């Protein structure tokens, strides 16, 4: 009985912990998958001006 | 038909649509008794999954003609089982994604195929790394 | 009609309100033979939107109304097509079937059921 | 005797809960970073299409 | 001619459906029946727990003989519904012969009947007139016939094929045995996997999408504990030897019924 | 007020509409109910019943089983019954003729089962046709 409890908790603590840890690497990856997302999103949002004023220009052409 | 069929293509296209064109040929024949046998084993449903997805592929929009590596990644990526998991609404708005992926993270791949015009063992890599890229950023 | 004459907004409605008119079609000898209730829950709803969207699509016209007596209605592309959305998203699921005929706009509708409602009650 | 025979069951008894302790942290520590690396990528994924339709 | 054709044969469609819900609805007025035994051939197990007793039906006896009774269809175009029973009928035969436990068939059914008629190279126990609408008069009949046949020893183990209703695109034959009904009232295939019989799922049709299917759903069936001052009349051995040839008669009727 | 009685066959339930008295057959032989009984459960021998309620009591010959009686309640599981009144008397009788008949020739150790159950079977349907 004694080695049984204390394998569940010691098991146990390493998985919560283990979880949680877990949980703030993705903090870590959500975190860069966020800024890179946002980069991203500016630049295509570069994209379409910068083609739509070639397009412009070339419309005048 | 064509009568010149594949003396017209180029390599990389002779190799990747070899597979494709069988893969049509099991799905015109798996769609028949589809219904007839209706309890499909994974043999000839995953075949059929397949099929539906490969279907896909051959779809396209009016006057937006896709360059020949686009048709060479495109259809390179049906054929492997890689959109099989992904929703049959999901699949032309995958691939329009990883295509223009692959032209802005991944140029290497254009360069291999509109120079040695041959799927090659380091072009199949290249577009395989972009592929993974791709489909995780799909997903979130 | 195709998406990138008509937009792609008008498109969607428009393949939709076929499917579920379809379907009703192809449903009517199932209905005879296992009732309404014993359809299963999506095909109870695209029965009844079935339903709805074909009285919905009759309307009242200028010209008739010397032999009906009820003013006709000219109704907008925009109008139509706003209509249309309300009912395949459920929306108006709680409104009867005799609120959709022979009325113009989505709006009439909805005040030809409340109306409805209040005679009833009356 | 009886003391000594409490503490030792007790020792084993608390050892296999903190064991089953630390398995429920390990586990909620895996979960919530599971959650955490979804919102950075759904997150930028988000910004990019909010900030790329601005663009557009 | 071809468009009269197409006219008669999507009659004959519509007059098949309204005929299988008429069947849902035969086997769902049974159900109190099914549902009322199950729950008395538990607390009949469960207060017994002796022994000594042995009931005839339950008897279990070395298997040198095995009946197996065929339940096919009445009439013909019915897609491969009554070819695919017999010929699910031949591997059990054929299985038997690599057993060598000397088969004997019990066929109902006009399709069956004249299957077995033209071969006579099997023995037949007995012909039986298929029908429609089955009731528990013509399932009495085949009722009295096994139960009276399985208590004799010359046959064990009797067992019954049929296609239970699973879908409307495939309907596979399964194998069950009959005979000798489990004490525990446990039914079960002779694969070798066996249902509480507590739980069993009627066959509803409902129209999945556009498509006309069904669906197998089983509710279970909860026993209540019987009475505490409960006063068996006979014995509880003797009264279970009554229960057993209900529960057998019930079985065999809903083979039949799921079959048609 | 009353016990409440519901026979039921494996396809049809009979009887579900409720009585001040019964009186059934059993394996015992004979047993009666009257309503406030004791919780008991009887297997039910082939052979018929009589139920009384208020002025009219009638036969319907059932085929046995089982029957339970709980509080104020009957239910009574049998494979096969017939109201009595429904059976017309003389093909019944017919019937258990040719039983007899068959039985009489019907030989060997099943067949006879057979031959004295369908015969024990059709007796008792002129029994409630009769009565």
Redesign the interface.
């Known amino acids: 009985t004694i080695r049984n409890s204390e394998e569940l908790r010691g098991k146990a603590i390493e998985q919560l912990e283990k979880a949680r840890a877990r949980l703030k690497k993705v903090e870590m990856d959500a975190d860069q998958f966020r800024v890179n997302g946002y980069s991203e999103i500016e630049r295509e949002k570069m994209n379409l001006i910068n083609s739509t004023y070639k397009t412009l220009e070339q419309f005048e052409n | 038909v064509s009568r010149v069929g594949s003396a017209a293509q180029i390599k990389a296209m002779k190799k990747v649509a070899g597979k494709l064109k069988l893969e049509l040929a099991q799905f015109a024949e798996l769609e028949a008794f589809a219904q007839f046998a209706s309890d499909l084993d994974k043999a000839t449903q995953n075949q059929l999954a397949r099929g539906q997805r490969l279907r896909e592929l051959l779809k396209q929009p009016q006057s937006a003609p896709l360059t020949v590596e686009e048709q060479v990644m495109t259809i390179y990526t049906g054929t492997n089982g890689y959109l099989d998991s992904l929703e049959l609404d999901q699949v032309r708005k995958y691939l329009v994604e990883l295509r223009t992926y692959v032209k802005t993270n991944k140029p290497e791949f254009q360069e291999i195929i509109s120079s040695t015009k041959t799927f090659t063992e380091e072009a199949e890599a290249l577009l395989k790394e972009a592929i993974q890229e791709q489909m995780e950023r799909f997903l979130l | 009609l195709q998406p990138r004459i008509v937009g792609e907004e008008h498109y969607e409605i428009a393949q939709r309100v076929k499917e579920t008119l379809q379907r009703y079609k192809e449903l009517q000898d199932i209905i005879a033979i296992l009732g309404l209730d014993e359809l299963s829950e999506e095909d109870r709803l695209t029965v009844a939107r079935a339903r709805k969207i074909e009285r919905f699509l009759s309307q009242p016209f200028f010209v008739a109304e010397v032999f009906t007596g009820s003013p006709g209605k000219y109704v907008g592309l925009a109008e139509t097509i706003r209509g249309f959305q309300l009912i395949l998203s459920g929306e108006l699921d709680s409104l009867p079937e005799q609120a959709f005929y022979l009325v113009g706009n989505i709006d009439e509708a909805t005040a030809k059921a409340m109306n409805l409602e209040m005679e009833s009650k009356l | 005797l009886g003391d000594f025979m409490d503490k030792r069951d007790a020792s084993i008894k608390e050892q296999l809960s903190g064991v089953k302790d630390t398995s429920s942290e390990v586990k909620q520590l895996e979960e919530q970073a599971n959650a955490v690396m979804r919102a950075a990528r759904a997150e930028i994924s988000a910004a990019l299409n909010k900030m790329k339709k601005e663009t557009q | 001619s071809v468009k009269n054709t197409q006219k008669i044969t999507e009659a004959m469609k519509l007059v098949a459906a309204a005929k299988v819900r008429r069947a849902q609805e035969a086997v769902v007025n049974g159900r109190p029946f099914s549902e009322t035994l199950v729950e008395v051939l538990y607390n009949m197990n469960e207060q017994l727990q002796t022994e000594d007793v042995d009931v005839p039906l339950t008897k279990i006896r070395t298997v040198k003989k095995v009946a197996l009774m065929v339940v096919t269809g009445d009439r013909g175009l019915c897609g491969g519904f009554n070819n695919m029973l017999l010929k699910k009928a031949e591997s059990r035969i054929a299985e038997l012969k690599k057993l060598g436990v000397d088969y004997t068939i019990i066929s109902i059914g006009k399709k069956g009947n004249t299957y077995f008629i033209r071969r006579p190279e099997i023995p037949v126990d007995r012909y039986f007139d298929g029908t429609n609408l089955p009731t528990a008069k013509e399932a009495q009949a085949i009722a009295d016939d096994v139960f009276s046949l399985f208590v004799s020893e010359e046959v064990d183990k009797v067992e019954m094929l049929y296609t239970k209703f699973v879908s409307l695109v495939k309907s596979d034959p399964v194998i069950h045995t009959l005979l000798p009904l489990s004490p525990k009232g446990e039914i079960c295939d002779i694969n070798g996997k066996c249902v509480d019989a507590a739980e069993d799922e009627l066959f509803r049709l409902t129209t999945k999408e556009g498509k006309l299917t069904v669906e197998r759903d089983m509710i279970k069936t909860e026993t209540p504990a019987f009475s505490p001052i409960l006063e068996f009349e006979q014995d509880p051995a003797q009264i279970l030897d009554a229960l057993l040839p209900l529960y057998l008669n019930s079985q065999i009727l809903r083979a039949l019924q799921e079959s048609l | 007020m009353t016990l409440n009685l519901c026979v039921?066959?494996?396809?049809?339930?009979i009887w579900n509409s409720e009585v001040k008295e019964i009186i059934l057959s059993?394996?015992?032989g004979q047993?009666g109910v009257l309503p406030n009984h004791?919780?008991?459960?009887?297997?039910?021998?082939i052979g018929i019943l009589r139920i009384r309620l208020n002025d009219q009591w009638l036969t319907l010959a059932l085929?046995?089983?089982?029957a339970?009686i709980?509080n104020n309640e009957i239910?009574i599981?049998?494979?096969?019954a017939e109201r009595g009144s429904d059976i017309d008397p003389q093909e019944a009788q017919q019937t258990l003729e040719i039983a007899e008949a068959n039985l009489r020739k019907a030989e060997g150790?099943?067949?006879k089962?057979?031959a004295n159950?369908?015969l024990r079977r059709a007796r008792t349907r002129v029994e409630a046709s009769n009565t």
């Not at chain 6, 039921?8 to 339930?13: A, D, G, I, K």
């Not at chain 6, 599981?77 to 096969?80: A, E, H, I, S």
């Open positions: 039921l066959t494996p396809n049809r339930s059993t394996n015992s047993i004791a919780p008991t459960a009887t297997a039910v021998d085929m046995g089983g089982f339970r709980g239910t599981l049998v494979n096969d150790k099943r067949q089962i057979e159950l369908a």
